From Swiss-Prot, chain A:
Family classification: Belongs to the TNF receptor-associated factor family. A subfamily.
Quaternary structure note: Homotrimer. Homooligomer. N-terminal region is dimeric while C-terminal region is trimeric; maybe providing a mode of oligomerization. Upon IL1B treatment, forms a complex with PELI1, IRAK1, IRAK4 and MYD88; this complex recruits MAP3K7/TAK1, TAB1 and TAB2 to mediate NF-kappa-B activation. Direct binding of SMAD6 to PELI1 prevents the complex formation and hence negatively regulates IL1R-TLR signaling and eventually NF-kappa-B-mediated gene expression. Binds to TNFRSF5/CD40 and TNFRSF11A/RANK.
Residue numbers spanned by region Interaction with TANK: 9-155
Entry protein name: TNF receptor-associated factor 6
Organism: Homo sapiens (Human)
Compartment list: Cytoplasm; Cytoplasm, Cell cortex; Nucleus; Lipid droplet
Interval of the full protein contained in this chain: 347 to 501 of 522
Protein modification: This ligand-induced cell stimulation leads to dimerization/oligomerization of TRAF6 molecules, followed by auto-ubiquitination which involves UBE2N and UBE2V1 and leads to TRAF6 activation. This 'Lys-63' site-specific poly-ubiquitination appears to be associated with the activation of signaling molecules. Endogenous autoubiquitination occurs only for the cytoplasmic form.
Expression (tissue specificity): Expressed in heart, brain, placenta, lung, liver, skeletal muscle, kidney and pancreas.
Organism domain of life: Eukaryota
Residue(s) of cross-link: Glycyl lysine isopeptide (Lys-Gly) (interchain with G-Cter in SUMO): 107
Domain notes: The coiled coil domain mediates homo- and hetero-oligomerization.
Domain MATH: 4-153
Phenotypic consequence of residue 107 to R: Loss of SUMO1-modification and c-myb-mediated transcriptional repressive activation
Length: 155, 8
């Protein structure tokens, strides 16, 4: 049996978010808090649609992971060590599909991987330039006005 | 590239 916890983050009303970005309105959305297992760590993701004029990350989708205080925290090791696979799923036709993803190794020396003293860790870990918005028109990443972001954690 | 720590 597999051991990794996998969360599927459904971001709906995406067309609206894209419209805002195109009108130079900031877009930053947090995923609901989710667990990597039972017992497991509690995390949430933070996704940005950077402004079209954003210096150093114009028109880019940014994606980060943040640790949160979870109910199983007393039974887990700290700081967190392991890998986190972030994927924006291709919802294209039956034939071969090509998702957009990155895999990151946790850096135990960073505060992002410690348990926060408040519900959501201020410090997160991720990619400022995860995927360019232009990539969204290259494949069917948006389906039924929804974007699918997959987060797989391996301890 | 490599991921980075980012504060929000």
């Amino acid at each position: 049996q597999q051991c990794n916890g996998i969360y599927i983050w459904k971001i709906g009303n995406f067309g609206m978010h894209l419209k805002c970005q195109e009108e130079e309105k900031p877009v930053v959305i947090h995923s609901p808090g989710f667990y990597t297992g039972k017992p497991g760590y509690k995390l949430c993701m933070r996704l940005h649609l950077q402004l079209p004029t954003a210096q150093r990350c114009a028109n880019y989708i940014s994606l980060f992971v943040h640790t949160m205080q979870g109910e199983y925290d007393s039974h887990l090791p700290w700081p967190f060590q392991g890998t986190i696979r972030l994927t924006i799923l291709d919802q294209s036709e039956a034939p071969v599909r090509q998702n957009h993803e990155e895999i990151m190794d946790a850096k135990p020396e960073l505060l992002a991987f410690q348990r926060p003293t408040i519900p959501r860790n201020p410090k997160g870990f991720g990619y400022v330039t995860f995927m360019h918005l232009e990539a969204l028109r290259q494949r069917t990443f948006i389906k039924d006005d929804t974007l699918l972001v997959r987060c797989e954690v391996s301890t | 590239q490599m991921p980075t720590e980012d504060e929000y």
